[PDB]
Amino acid sequence: MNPPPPETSNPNKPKRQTNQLQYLLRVVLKTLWKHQFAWPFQQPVDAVKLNLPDYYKIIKTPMDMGTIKKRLENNYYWNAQECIQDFNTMFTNCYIYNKPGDDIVLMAEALEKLFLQKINELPT
Ligand SMILES: COc1cc(C(=O)NCCc2cccs2)cc(OC)c1OC
């Protein structure tokens, strides 16, 4: 069975909006979303649908771009670094669950390179 997806709101967590977080939604996330390899990453891994009964037996900090998008829309994050950490968790989860050379890993590697390209320079 699937675990609950990561929270996208939390009333006792303080919220914040910054220029860098606005950019992370408007430019970084919304650009990566349109990439031809983004589709595996647009929603939480559904282990029942995808027939990955070991996924959440291996991956204990799940993350995906649909969750990140909702978090950005809700001003869930305190700063850009917190959001960037969720992207990095999403990519590393893929590398951990799989192995080098797998099609899904080739997709994550390409997306990670584009992500790094986009966050290399952030607004002030
Ligand atoms: C989001 O992370 C993952 C997503 C998928 C996924 O959508 N699989 C559907 C068919 C595919 C297989 C190869 C390319 S896409 C598979 C993974 O591992 C098999 C992942 O990593 C855990």
Swiss-Prot record:
Phosphorylation by CK2 disrupt the intramolecular binding between the bromo domain 2 and the NPS region and promotes binding between the NPS and the BID regions, leading to activate the protein and promote binding to acetylated histones. In absence of phosphorylation, BRD4 does not localize to p53/TP53 target gene promoters, phosphorylation promoting recruitment to p53/TP53 target promoters. The record marks N98 as: Acetylated histone binding. Coiled coil: none annotated. There is a cross-link at K57 (Glycyl lysine isopeptide (Lys-Gly) (interchain with G-Cter in SUMO2)). Changing D103G: Found in a patient with a neurodevelopmental syndrome; uncertain significance. It is linked to Cornelia de Lange syndrome 6: A form of Cornelia de Lange syndrome, a clinically heterogeneous developmental disorder associated with malformations affecting multiple systems. It is characterized by facial dysmorphisms, abnormal hands and feet, growth delay, cognitive retardation, hirsutism, gastroesophageal dysfunction and cardiac, ophthalmologic and genitourinary anomalies. CDLS6 inheritance is autosomal dominant. JQ1, a thieno-triazolo-1,4-diazepine derivative, and I-BET, a benzodiazepine derivative, have been tested on tumors with success. Treatment with GSK1210151A (I-BET151, a I-BET derivative) has strong effets on mixed lineage leukemia and promotes myeloid differentiation and leukemia stem-cell depletion. Interacts with p53/TP53; the interaction is direct. Interacts (via CTD region) with CDK9 and CCNT1, acting as an associated component of P-TEFb complex. Interacts with RELA (when acetylated at 'Lys-310'). Interacts (via NET domain) with NSD3, CHD4, BICRA and ATAD5. The interaction with BICRA bridges BRD4 to the GBAF complex. Interacts (via NET domain) with JMJD6 (via JmjC and N-terminal domains); the interaction is stronger in presence of ssRNA and recruits JMJD6 on distal enhancers. Interacts with NSD3. Interacts with NIPBL. Belongs to the BET family. Chromatin reader protein that recognizes and binds acetylated histones and plays a key role in transmission of epigenetic memory across cell divisions and transcription regulation. Remains associated with acetylated chromatin throughout the entire cell cycle and provides epigenetic memory for postmitotic G1 gene transcription by preserving acetylated chromatin status and maintaining high-order chromatin structure. During interphase, plays a key role in regulating the transcription of signal-inducible genes by associating with the P-TEFb complex and recruiting it to promoters. The NET domain mediates interaction with a number of chromatin proteins involved in transcription regulation (NSD3, JMJD6, CHD4, GLTSCR1 and ATAD5). The C-terminal (CTD) region mediates interaction and recruitment of CDK9 and CCNT1 subunits of the P-TEFb complex. It is also required for maintenance of higher-order chromatin structure. This is Bromodomain-containing protein 4. It comes from Homo sapiens. The gene is BRD4.
